[PDB]
Amino acid sequence: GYEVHHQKLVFFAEDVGSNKGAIIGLMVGGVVIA
Amino acid sequence: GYEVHHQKLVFFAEDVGSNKGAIIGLMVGGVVIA
Amino acid sequence: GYEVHHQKLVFFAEDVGSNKGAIIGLMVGGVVIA
Amino acid sequence: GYEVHHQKLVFFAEDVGSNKGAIIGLMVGGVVIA
Amino acid sequence: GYEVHHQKLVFFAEDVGSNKGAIIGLMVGGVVIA
Amino acid sequence: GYEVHHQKLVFFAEDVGSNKGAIIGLMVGGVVIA
Amino acid sequence: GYEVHHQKLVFFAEDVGSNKGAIIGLMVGGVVIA
Amino acid sequence: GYEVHHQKLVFFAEDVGSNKGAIIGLMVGGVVIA
Amino acid sequence: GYEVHHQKLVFFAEDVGSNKGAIIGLMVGGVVIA
Amino acid sequence: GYEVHHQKLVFFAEDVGSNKGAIIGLMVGGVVIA
Amino acid sequence: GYEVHHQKLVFFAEDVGSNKGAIIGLMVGGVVIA
Amino acid sequence: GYEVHHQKLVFFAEDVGSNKGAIIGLMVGGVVIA
Amino acid sequence: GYEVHHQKLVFFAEDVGSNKGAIIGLMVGGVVIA
Amino acid sequence: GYEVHHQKLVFFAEDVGSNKGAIIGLMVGGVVIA
Amino acid sequence: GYEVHHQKLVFFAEDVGSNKGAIIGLMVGGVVIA
Amino acid sequence: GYEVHHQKLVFFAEDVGSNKGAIIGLMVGGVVIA
Amino acid sequence: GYEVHHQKLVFFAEDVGSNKGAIIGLMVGGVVIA
Amino acid sequence: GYEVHHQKLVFFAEDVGSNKGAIIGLMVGGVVIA
Amino acid sequence: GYEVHHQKLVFFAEDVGSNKGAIIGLMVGGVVIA
Amino acid sequence: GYEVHHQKLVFFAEDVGSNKGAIIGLMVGGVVIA
Numbered sequence: 197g198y199e200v201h202h203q204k205l206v207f208f209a210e211d212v213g214s215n216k217g218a219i220i221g222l223m224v225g226g227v228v229i230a
Numbered sequence: 231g232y233e234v235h236h237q238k239l240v241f242f243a244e245d246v247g248s249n250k251g252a253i254i255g256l257m258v259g260g261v262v263i264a
Numbered sequence: 265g266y267e268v269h270h271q272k273l274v275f276f277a278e279d280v281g282s283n284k285g286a287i288i289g290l291m292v293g294g295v296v297i298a
Numbered sequence: 299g300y301e302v303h304h305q306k307l308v309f310f311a312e313d314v315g316s317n318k319g320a321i322i323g324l325m326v327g328g329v330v331i332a
Numbered sequence: 333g334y335e336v337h338h339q340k341l342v343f344f345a346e347d348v349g350s351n352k353g354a355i356i357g358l359m360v361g362g363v364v365i366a
Numbered sequence: 367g368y369e370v371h372h373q374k375l376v377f378f379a380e381d382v383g384s385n386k387g388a389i390i391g392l393m394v395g396g397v398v399i400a
Numbered sequence: 401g402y403e404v405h406h407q408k409l410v411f412f413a414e415d416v417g418s419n420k421g422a423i424i425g426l427m428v429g430g431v432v433i434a
Numbered sequence: 435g436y437e438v439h440h441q442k443l444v445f446f447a448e449d450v451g452s453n454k455g456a457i458i459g460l461m462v463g464g465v466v467i468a
Numbered sequence: 469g470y471e472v473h474h475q476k477l478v479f480f481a482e483d484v485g486s487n488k489g490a491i492i493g494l495m496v497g498g499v500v501i502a
Numbered sequence: 503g504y505e506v507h508h509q510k511l512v513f514f515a516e517d518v519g520s521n522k523g524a525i526i527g528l529m530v531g532g533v534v535i536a
Numbered sequence: 537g538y539e540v541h542h543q544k545l546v547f548f549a550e551d552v553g554s555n556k557g558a559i560i561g562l563m564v565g566g567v568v569i570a
Numbered sequence: 571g572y573e574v575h576h577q578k579l580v581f582f583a584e585d586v587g588s589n590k591g592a593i594i595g596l597m598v599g600g601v602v603i604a
Numbered sequence: 605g606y607e608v609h610h611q612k613l614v615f616f617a618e619d620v621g622s623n624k625g626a627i628i629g630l631m632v633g634g635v636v637i638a
Numbered sequence: 639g640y641e642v643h644h645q646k647l648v649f650f651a652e653d654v655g656s657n658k659g660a661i662i663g664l665m666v667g668g669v670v671i672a
Numbered sequence: 673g674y675e676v677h678h679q680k681l682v683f684f685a686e687d688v689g690s691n692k693g694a695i696i697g698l699m700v701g702g703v704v705i706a
Numbered sequence: 707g708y709e710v711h712h713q714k715l716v717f718f719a720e721d722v723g724s725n726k727g728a729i730i731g732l733m734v735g736g737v738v739i740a
Numbered sequence: 741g742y743e744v745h746h747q748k749l750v751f752f753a754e755d756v757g758s759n760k761g762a763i764i765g766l767m768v769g770g771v772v773i774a
Numbered sequence: 775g776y777e778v779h780h781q782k783l784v785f786f787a788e789d790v791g792s793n794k795g796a797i798i799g800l801m802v803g804g805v806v807i808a
Numbered sequence: 809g810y811e812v813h814h815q816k817l818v819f820f821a822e823d824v825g826s827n828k829g830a831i832i833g834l835m836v837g838g839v840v841i842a
Numbered sequence: 843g844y845e846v847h848h849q850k851l852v853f854f855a856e857d858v859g860s861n862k863g864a865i866i867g868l869m870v871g872g873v874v875i876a
Contacts, residue, residue, distance in 0.1 A: 198233070199269075200233075209276060215252075217317070219253045223259065223290070225292050225294045225438070225441070230252075237462075239392075259404070271306070281315045290324045295470075296329070298331070301337075305532070307341045309343045310343065311346065320355070332365070336533060339497070341528075352658045387419045387421045401435045401436065402437075403439075406441075414449065422453075424458045425459045432464065434453075444478045458490075468502045472505075477510070480515065481514060492529075495528070542575045544768065548583070552586045556590045564598045565711075574735070578802065596630045598715050599745075599747035608642045608769070613836050623657045634744045637670075642873060645837035647836050656690045659692045659693045666701075681870050700815040702846050703812060714749070716748075725758070743779075745780075751786065771804055787822065789823045799833045808827075815847075818852045822855075828860075
């Protein structure tokens with residue numbers, strides 16, 4: 197008798213507001229200018 | 231008797247607001263200007 | 265008799281406000297200017 | 299009889315306010331200017 | 333009879349206010365100017 | 367003058383050996399028996 | 401003048417040997433038997 | 435003049451040997467039997 | 469003039485030997501039997 | 503003129519030997535039996 | 537013998553760059569949100 | 571014999587850079603949020 | 605014999621850089637938040 | 639014989655750098671928050 | 673024979689650097705928070 | 707909740723009396739004889 | 741809750757009496773004879 | 775809770791009497807004879 | 809709770825009497841004869 | 843709880859009497875004859 201329930205994973209966000217700049221969830225590499 | 235329920239994975243967002251700039255979920259690499 | 269429930273993982277945020285600058289969840293490497 | 303419930307892990311934040319500068323959850327390395 | 337409940341881990345913050353400067357959760361290394 | 371090069375991302379593996387059991391890269395949820 | 405190079409990210413492995421049991425990279429939730 | 439190079443991130447392993455039991459990189463929750 | 473190089477991050481291991489039991493990198497919660 | 507180099511971070515191990523029992527890098531909570 | 541030449545009046549600007557926010561030359565009154 | 575030449579008046583600017591916020595040359599009154 | 609030349613008046617600026625906040629040349633009154 | 643030349647008046651600035659906060663040339667009155 | 677030349681008046685500045693706080697040239701009165 | 711009211715701007719006058727001579731509100735340049 | 745009211749700006753006058761001579765509000769340059 | 779009220783700015787005058795001569799509010803440059 | 813009120817600024821005058829000669833509020837430069 | 847009130851600034855005068863000669867509020871430079 198195994199019951200597993202209500203598990204959640206969020207990497208970056210659930211709610212992201214307005215953006216004028218730069219939003220990146222994940223990057224291996226590079227140059228970001230904002 | 232195995233019951234598994236209500237699991238969720240979100241990588242970047244559920245709700246993303248207005249965008250004037252740059253939004254990237256995932257990048258391996260590059261140049262981002264905003 | 266095993267019951268597992270209500271577990272949550274958040275890496276960066278649940279709620280992210282307005283952005284004029286640079287927001288990065290995870291980076292291996294690079295240059296960020298804001 | 300094993301019951302495990304209500305566990306949470308937050309790496310960076312739950313609520314992130316407005317951003318004009320640079321916010322990085324995790325970085326292996328680089329240069330950040332804000 | 334094992335019951336485990338209400339455990340929480342926060343690495344950086346739960347609530348992060350407005351940012352003009354540089355906020356980094358974790359870094360292995362680099363240069364940060366704010 | 368921006369140059370970005372040789373970035374790589376691997377999620378599960380580059381080289382997976384032989385399999386008699388069960389290998390899953392990513393699972394949101396379920397029951398796995400090997 | 402920006403140059404970014406040779407960054408790498410590995411989540412589970414680069415090289416996974418043989419498997420008779422169960423290997424899961426990422427799981428939000430469930431029951432795993434090996 | 436910015437140069438960033440040779441950064442690496444490994445979450446679970448680079449090299450995983452043989453498996454008769456259960457290996458999980460990341461789990462939000464559940465029941466694991468080996 | 470900024471130069472950043474050779475930074476590394478390892479969470480669980482670089483080299484994981486053979487497994488008859490249970491290995492978990494990160495767990496928010498649950499029941500683990502080996 | 504800034505130069506930063508050769509920084510390293512290890513959380514659980516670099517080299518993990520064989521396992522008959524239970525190894526967990528990080529746990530928020532639960533029941534572990536070996 | 538009267539000679540008048542090369543006179544210039546600029547109220548706001550000669551060159552205005554890119555705009556994501558609010559630019560107003562002159563206002564008697566009101567509410568401005570950017 | 572009257573000669574008048576090369577006179578200039580600038581009220582706000584000659585060159586205005588990029589704008590994410592609020593730029594107002596002149597205001598009699600109000601509320602400005604940026 | 606009257607000669608008048610090369611006179612300049614600048615009220616706020618000649619060159620204004622990038623703006624994320626609030627820039628006001630002149631105000632009689634109000635509330636400014638940045 | 640009257641010659642008048644090379645006169646300059648600057649009230650606030652000639653060169654204004656980047657702005658995240660609040661810059662006001664002149665105000666009769668009010669509330670400024672930055 | 674009257675010659676007048678090379679006169680300059682600066683009220684606040686010639687060069688103003690980056691601003692995160694509040695810069696006011698002149699104010700008759702009010703409340704300033706930075 | 708924002709309310710802005712009763713702001714006024716007058717450049718030259720509200721009430722100009724009789725004129726036998728020369729009245730000019732704004733002039734970039736020229737010769738004026740009265 | 742913001743309320744801004746009764747601000748006024750006058751450049752040259754509110755009430756200008758009779759004129760036999762020369763009245764100029766603003767001049768960038770020239771020759772004025774009364 | 776912000777309230778700003780009754781601010782006033784006058785540059786040259788509120789009330790200007792009769793004129794036989796020359797009245798100039800602001801001049802960048804020139805020759806004025808009365 | 810901020811309240812700002814009754815601030816006033818006068819540059820040249822509030823009340824200017826009759827003029828037979830020359831009155832100048834502000835001059836960057838020139839020749840003035842009365 | 844901030845309250846600021848009844849501040850005043852006068853540069854040249856509030857009340858200027860009749861003028862047969864030359865009155866200048868501010869001069870950067872020149873020749874003045876009365």
